[PDB]
Amino acid sequence: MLGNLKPQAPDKILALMGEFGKIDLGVGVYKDATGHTPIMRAVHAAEQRMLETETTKTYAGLSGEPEFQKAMGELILGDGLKSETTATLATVGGTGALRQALELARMANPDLRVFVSDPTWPNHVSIMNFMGLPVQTYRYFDAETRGVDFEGMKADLAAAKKGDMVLLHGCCHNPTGANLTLDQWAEIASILEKTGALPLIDLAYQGFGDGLEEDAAGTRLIASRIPEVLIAASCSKNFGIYRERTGCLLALCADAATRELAQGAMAFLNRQTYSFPPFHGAKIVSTVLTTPELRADWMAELEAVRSGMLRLREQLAGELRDLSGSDRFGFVAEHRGMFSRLGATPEQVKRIKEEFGIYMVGDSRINIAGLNDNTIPILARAIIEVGV
Amino acid sequence: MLGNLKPQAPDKILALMGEFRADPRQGKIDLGVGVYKDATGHTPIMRAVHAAEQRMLETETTKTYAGLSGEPEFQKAMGELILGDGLKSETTATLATVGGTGALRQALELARMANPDLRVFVSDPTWPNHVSIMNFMGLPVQTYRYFDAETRGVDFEGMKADLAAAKKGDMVLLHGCCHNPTGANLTLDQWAEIASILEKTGALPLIDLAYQGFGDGLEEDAAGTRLIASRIPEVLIAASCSKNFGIYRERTGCLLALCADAATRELAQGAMAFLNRQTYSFPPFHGAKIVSTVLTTPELRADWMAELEAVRSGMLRLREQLAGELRDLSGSDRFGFVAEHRGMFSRLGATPEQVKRIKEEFGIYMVGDSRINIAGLNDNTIPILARAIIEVGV
Numbered sequence: 001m002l003g004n005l006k007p008q009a010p011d012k013i014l015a016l017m018g019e020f021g022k023i024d025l026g027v028g029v030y031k032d033a034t035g036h037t038p039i040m041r042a043v044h045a046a047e048q049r050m051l052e053t054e055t056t057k058t059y060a061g062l063s064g065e066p067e068f069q070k071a072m073g074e075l076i077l078g079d080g081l082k083s084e085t086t087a088t089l090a091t092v093g094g095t096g097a098l099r100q101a102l103e104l105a106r107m108a109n110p111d112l113r114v115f116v117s118d119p120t121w122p123n124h125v126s127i128m129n130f131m132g133l134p135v136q137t138y139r140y141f142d143a144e145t146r147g148v149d150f151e152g153m154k155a156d157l158a159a160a161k162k163g164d165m166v167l168l169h170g171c172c173h174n175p176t177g178a179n180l181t182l183d184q185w186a187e188i189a190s191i192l193e194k195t196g197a198l199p200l201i202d203l204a205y206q207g208f209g210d211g212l213e214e215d216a217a218g219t220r221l222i223a224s225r226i227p228e229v230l231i232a233a234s235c236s237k238n239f240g241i242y243r244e245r246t247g248c249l250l251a252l253c254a255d256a257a258t259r260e261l262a263q264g265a266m267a268f269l270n271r272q273t274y275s276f277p278p279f280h281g282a283k284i285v286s287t288v289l290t291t292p293e294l295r296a297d298w299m300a301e302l303e304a305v306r307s308g309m310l311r312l313r314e315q316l317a318g319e320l321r322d323l324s325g326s327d328r329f330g331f332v333a334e335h336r337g338m339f340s341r342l343g344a345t346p347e348q349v350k351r352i353k354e355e356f357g358i359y360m361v362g363d364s365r366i367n368i369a370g371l372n373d374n375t376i377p378i379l380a381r382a383i384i385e386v387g388v
Numbered sequence: 389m390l391g392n393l394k395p396q397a398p399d400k401i402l403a404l405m406g407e408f409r410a411d412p413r414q415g416k417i418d419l420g421v422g423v424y425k426d427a428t429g430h431t432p433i434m435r436a437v438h439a440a441e442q443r444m445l446e447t448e449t450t451k452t453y454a455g456l457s458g459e460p461e462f463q464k465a466m467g468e469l470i471l472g473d474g475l476k477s478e479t480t481a482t483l484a485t486v487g488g489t490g491a492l493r494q495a496l497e498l499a500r501m502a503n504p505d506l507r508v509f510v511s512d513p514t515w516p517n518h519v520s521i522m523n524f525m526g527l528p529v530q531t532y533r534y535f536d537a538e539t540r541g542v543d544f545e546g547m548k549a550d551l552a553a554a555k556k557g558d559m560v561l562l563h564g565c566c567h568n569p570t571g572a573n574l575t576l577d578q579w580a581e582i583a584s585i586l587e588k589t590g591a592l593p594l595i596d597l598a599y600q601g602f603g604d605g606l607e608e609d610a611a612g613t614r615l616i617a618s619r620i621p622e623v624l625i626a627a628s629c630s631k632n633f634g635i636y637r638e639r640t641g642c643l644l645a646l647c648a649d650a651a652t653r654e655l656a657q658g659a660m661a662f663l664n665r666q667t668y669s670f671p672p673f674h675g676a677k678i679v680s681t682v683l684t685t686p687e688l689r690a691d692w693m694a695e696l697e698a699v700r701s702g703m704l705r706l707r708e709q710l711a712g713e714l715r716d717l718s719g720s721d722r723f724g725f726v727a728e729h730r731g732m733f734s735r736l737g738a739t740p741e742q743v744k745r746i747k748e749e750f751g752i753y754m755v756g757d758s759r760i761n762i763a764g765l766n767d768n769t770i771p772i773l774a775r776a777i778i779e780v781g782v
């Protein structure tokens with residue numbers, strides 16, 4: 001029987017790491033000056049305390065622990081957290097949240113379509129394909145200005161209708177790094193309510209753009225305007241606990257009734273997929289979040305990280321500027337997040353890795369965190385020499 | 389849109405605890421628990437497990453993305469734990485999963501990919517959760533006789549007769565050991581016969597191995613599974629570390645795809661990694677790392693096997709006592725099956741009416757199908773349960 005298994009397609013980003021003075025600028029993970037992905041001080045302190053307070057490992061909650069559910073809700077929505085109309089579901093990372101979100105939506109509407117940004121995280125499309133959900137794209141990245149073709153985005157979105165779902169990146173757009181402003185978000189919200197399309201927000205990098213609260217701004221705008229919203233958050237990057245697999249699905253509803261429905265459906269989704277969600281990572285998160293001392297050190301460390309990266313974008317931009325006398329590469333400093341699409345053609349991308357030895361995703365996606373003071377000029381030299 | 393959501397039934401477990409907790413009875417007993425509880429009513433963290441966690445806290449330097457299919461050390465240690473020396477790596481595909489339930493879900497998904505017209509045969513009865521997952525997927529589910537309500541043992545003739553109806557490509561789900569909920573198990577000779585039936589029909593066996601170590605012992609509990617692996621070329625094994633490692637909440641499981649050849653193993657391994665990827669990208673690391681650490685570290689593995697063995701023996705002594713108490717009271721050996729059953733669960737064969745009389749008259753709670761948790765018994769509760777069973781005319 002198993003011999004009938006057709007060969008499946010692998011993941012592009014992960015494939016790179018396998019195919020790796022080498023310079024890694026692929027996989028979206030934060031790395032420090034010494035090319036290491038550290039464990040955050042507070043996270044280490046949390047685990048340490050956990051190892052001393054936990055007396056049992058029995059089965060816990062099917063939708064995650066109340067402490068995790070409450071902390072995550074507050075972290076994301078701040079004061080916009082209306083417990084009476086919000087359903088929470090602890091998941092296996094942000095990807096697990098996205099999948100669960102799609103499963104929930106399809107249950108509610110068997111004939112749902114999904115609008116995704118051109119471009120967007122590859123893994124978004126693969127999952128939808130696997131599920132057999134019709135995917136449509138809305139213009140987003142402006143290839144010339146490397147910014148956002150907001151004009152086109154609004155036009156395409158206006159074509160959405162009731163029952164359809166729109167996937168938005170709350171901040172730090174993967175893979176472009178091009179992001180919407182609060183003014184743009186308000187306009188998107190008016191489009192959404194006019195069309196009746198359910199928004200699904202992918203919140204994977206809250207804290208890597210402009211700050212914890214500022215990065216949640218757009219999400220909070222949509223949440224205060226649209227009566228029904230879905231938010232799939234990840235604690236992988238902002239808490240540095242990638243391998244723990246922890247995230248959560250937030251279902252914002254209009255009334256308590258619908259809320260109890262969704263909460264029930266969500267708990268059922270977990271039960272039918274793997275019974276209980278993993279406890280360890282979720283415990284670290286709630287511990288950090290509910291312990292003043294721990295939250296403070298986490299906020300500080302995350303701040304240091306996001307600040308360092310911003311310095312790197314400006315440094316690289318400058319290097320390139322001086323290497324061409326032209327600030328064409330200025331968009332680099334304007335982008336926000338961990339990535340930036342350079343705009344180099346596929347042929348150039350491959351040429352750079354084969355001769356220069358710097359590995360970046362096929363669509364010219366570079367992980368800014370991968371650079372450093374001594375590798376920056378080298379990268380700049382490479383892009384300059386290759387530029388057709 | 390979400391208003392359309394059809395209300396989903398709760399876990400039921402909650403309702404059970406709701407009844408019990410509401411009961412104002414001083415001496416109320418709960419044999420409906422589904423986890424192991426020691427003498428003091430606690431589900432402790434095993435010594436080796438707490439040791440592994442201490443060791444991990446000191447040696448871990450990063451938490452970046454690890455393996456999509458799981459870690460090599462974990463996959464190997466689990467394969468050796470379940471298949472022993474009989475582990476043929478060249479044809480064995482492994483997938484770290486979110487607990488045993490995730491392993492089952494993935495096994496069913498993989499099988500459906502290989503054969504769309506898949507039909508699954510489940511025992512009568514089986515872990516309710518099995519059917520739930522299948523109904524959810526929309527897979528054809530067929531039942532095969534198993535529990536003999538009159539003797540409390542295996543209705544083997546019925547099992548064989550029904551299994552004979554399996555076609556090539558169908559999936560037959562077998563509990564490797566410690567049958568949940570019944571407690572009635574197959575002997576190695578019955579496993580041998582089952583293997584023959586499986587060869588004849590060409591049905592793919594899916595083995596649910598969640599209690600290795602709670603029956604007669606670690607190696608002993610894997611006996612039936614190892615026989616199947618030797619006779620049949622394609623075998624799917626869904627393993628759980630929740631109970632025998634006591635890491636229920638960490639969600640640690642394993643899916644082993646035994647294939648007829650290396651080429652087929654590559655396909656299975658790729659399709660499994662793909663399946664993990666399309667569900668949640670990467671599997672949970674913490675619990676798996678605890679497992680591989682306990683297993684690869686001599687000193688730890690030793691203490692673990694020692695602790696598991698003590699638990700196993702403790703439950704066996706519990707069964708003996710109960711069977712004895714019941715023998716003295718009944719003046720017969722009808723309840724002898726209590727000592728023959730293995731695992732932490734045992735279905736007594738009491739009807740829902742009798743189950744209700746037991747709760748109302750004696751304050752003893754158990755699952756509606758008369759399934760009890762042996763671990764919940766003790767020197768003080770045993771005399772009570774015995775008295776109850778007999779007084780209700782079971």
Ligand SMILES: *Cc1c(COP(=O)(O)O)cnc(C)c1O
Pocket residue numbers: 028092093094095096121174202204234235236237242246247668669
């Ligand atoms: C990181 C990320 C996720 C989630 O990753 P998990 O490891 O599953 O937490 C989801 N979407 C995007 C765009 C991401 O970058």
Ligand SMILES: *Cc1c(COP(=O)(O)O)cnc(C)c1O
Pocket residue numbers: 274275486487488489490515563568596598628629630636639640641
């Ligand atoms: C416990 C159990 C499982 C799976 O447990 P997980 O908690 O998902 O690891 C599977 N089958 C049976 C019969 C079980 O008792």
Ligand SMILES: Cc1ccc(CCC(=O)O)cc1
Pocket residue numbers: 011013014026027028029095121123174665669
């Ligand atoms: C499957 C997967 C791929 C990548 C990532 C990290 C985010 C990225 O590199 O785009 C997570 C999961």
